[PDB]
Design a protein around this ligand. Structure first.
Ligand SMILES: NC(=O)c1c[nH]c(C2CC2)n1
Lengths: 39, 156
């Protein structure tokens, strides 16, 4: 049996760590919900 | 059980110790997570039970106790925050500018951030604190890095 435990409030944090890039990708989505790259 | 709005961990005692299999959002009495986290199984919250109400394997989303409530959308221009809830670690906000998943059925925002498997279901927020989608379903690009879609459901 799975169970849930509270982890926090949902709030925007001012001055949070800023990272990650912004890739523009061509993708396909199948019937099983799997994303794949179109090339 | 506990029904206060906020982010929650999805745990299991089926495997060794207590294992975090994912994350979800409690909003307006409904718990929202990704389908691959629970596979549609019932959830426990203290002594209370949460039963699935809606789900779809292709969208990779599921809601418990009521219909999908999250309807905010990424504006296509601004930075957002992943409110990451990693296994055994404290909730942390990570700010990023989303990229784009271009599909035959339209464009979807995407977040280039890599976290452990049990982080799927962590909410992605706009500057107003509104959940614009959940993190955890995406693809592994050329350099072996992970990129998640910003997955949002439909509010009937
Ligand atoms: N393929 C991967 O590297 C992997 C899978 N899932 C995740 C994150 C939890 C979303 N990373």
């Amino acid at each position: 049996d799975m169970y849930i435990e509270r982890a926090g409030d949902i709030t925007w944090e001012k001055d949070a760590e800023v990272t990650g890039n912004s890739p523009r990708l061509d993708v396909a989505l199948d019937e099983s919900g799997d994303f794949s790259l179109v090339e | 059980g506990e029904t206060t709005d906020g982010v929650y961990r999805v745990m299991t005692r089926r495997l060794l110790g207590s294992t975090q299999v994912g994350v979800g959002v409690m909003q307006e009495g409904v718990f929202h997570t990704m389908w691959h986290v629970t596979k549609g199984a019932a959830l426990r919250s203290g002594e209370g039970r949460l039963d699935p109400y809606w789900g779809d394997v292709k969208q990779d989303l599921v809601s418990y106790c009521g219909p999908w409530k999250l309807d905010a959308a990424w504006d296509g221009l601004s930075e957002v925050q992943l409110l990451a809830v990693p296994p055994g670690e404290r909730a942390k906000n990570i700010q990023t500018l989303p990229g784009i998943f271009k599909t035959k059925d339209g464009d979807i925002g995407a977040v280039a951030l890599d976290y452990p498997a049990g982080t799927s279901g962590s909410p992605i927020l706009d500057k107003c604190g509104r959940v614009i989608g959940l993190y955890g379903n995406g693809v592994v690009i050329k350099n072996g890095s992970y990129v998640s879609a910003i997955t949002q459901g439909k509010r009937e």
